[PDB]
Design a protein around this ligand. Sequence first.
Ligand SMILES: C[C@H]1CNC(=O)c2cnn3ccc(nc23)N[C@H](C)c2cc(F)ccc2O1
Length: 297
Amino acid sequence: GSGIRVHHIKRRDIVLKWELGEGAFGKVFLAECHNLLPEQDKMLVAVKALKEASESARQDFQREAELLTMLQHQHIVRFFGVCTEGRPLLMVFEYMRHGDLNRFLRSHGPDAKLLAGGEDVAPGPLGLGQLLAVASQVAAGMVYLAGLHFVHRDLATRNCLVGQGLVVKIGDFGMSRDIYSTDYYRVGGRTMLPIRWMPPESILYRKFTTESDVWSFGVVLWEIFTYGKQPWYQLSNTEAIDCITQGRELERPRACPPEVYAIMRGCWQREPQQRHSIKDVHARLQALAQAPPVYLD
Ligand SMILES: C[C@H]1CNC(=O)c2cnn3ccc(nc23)N[C@H](C)c2cc(F)ccc2O1
C-alpha cells in the first residue's frame, strides 16, 4: 500500500523510434510520447526496456520507479513515469540529445577520430569554461543527492547525460549497462564494482559514504579534463586497486588548471573525514566556471 504515486503511462502514447543503446539487461529506445504532459501534444523521450520480467526484477523496478520519482532535481534527468500495461516493462525519461557524458567528452577530444558537430556546441576541444560548467552541474546533482543522504555507488561520466545547450544531469544509478565494460571489476559472480572510481575505504573495508562519492567525483573531474579517458588506463584492474590502496594519485591532466587539480586532490584525501564537503567542491567549481582561470600548454 503506502508509497509514492508513480505516474503510469499508456502504451498507446509511447511510440518506439529506434535503439539508442543496450545495457543493464535493458535496451534504451528513442520514442515519441503523446500527451505525456499538456505543454507538448507529441514529444521525444528516452525509454529503458527490461530484458527480464521475473518477480524479483519487477521488485527492482518498483523500488527504482519509486526512488526515481522522489529524486527530482535540476541536474538529474527528468523521470516521467513507467509503463507496466504490456511487457517489456518501460521507464520513461526526458531525451538528452548528446547521449552519455563520457562519449560526448571523447567526441570533443583532441584525440577524437572524426569531428562531431551539433548546433548547440562547437566541434573540437571544449572551452575550459564549459569543461567547468559540466563539472559544476554534476556537482550540483551530487549536492542534492547528499542532501537526502543518498549514495550513488557508481559516479562516472558514463552514468551522466548531456542535453540541449550542454545541460549535464545524472542519468543512471543501479543496474550497470555494459556487462563487458572495462571500468568494472568482476569480484564475485553477478557482482561488479567500478574499482577505478572507488576510494580505499571502499576497496578495503567495502564501505560507501557521501565521502566515497566525493572521492568518485574527483575521478569524474579527471575524466572530464581528459575528454573521457579511463582512469589508470595503462594499468590492470588489480594494478589500479594496488595504486588506489598504496595511495598513488591520478596525474594532472594537460588540459587541467592547477586550481581544479587542487579541487581533485581534496576529493582524494586518504582520510574520508578530511575530504572536502561536496557543497564546497560545487561552490568552487561554480565560482571557477563563472571566471575561468587562464592556462596554456
Ligand atoms: C543508452 C545509453 C545512452 N542514453 C541516451 O543517449 C539517452 C538520451 N536521453 N536519455 C535519457 C535516459 C537515458 N538515456 C538517454 N537512460 C539510460 C539508461 C542512460 C543513462 C546514462 F546516464 C547514460 C547512458 C544511458 O543509456
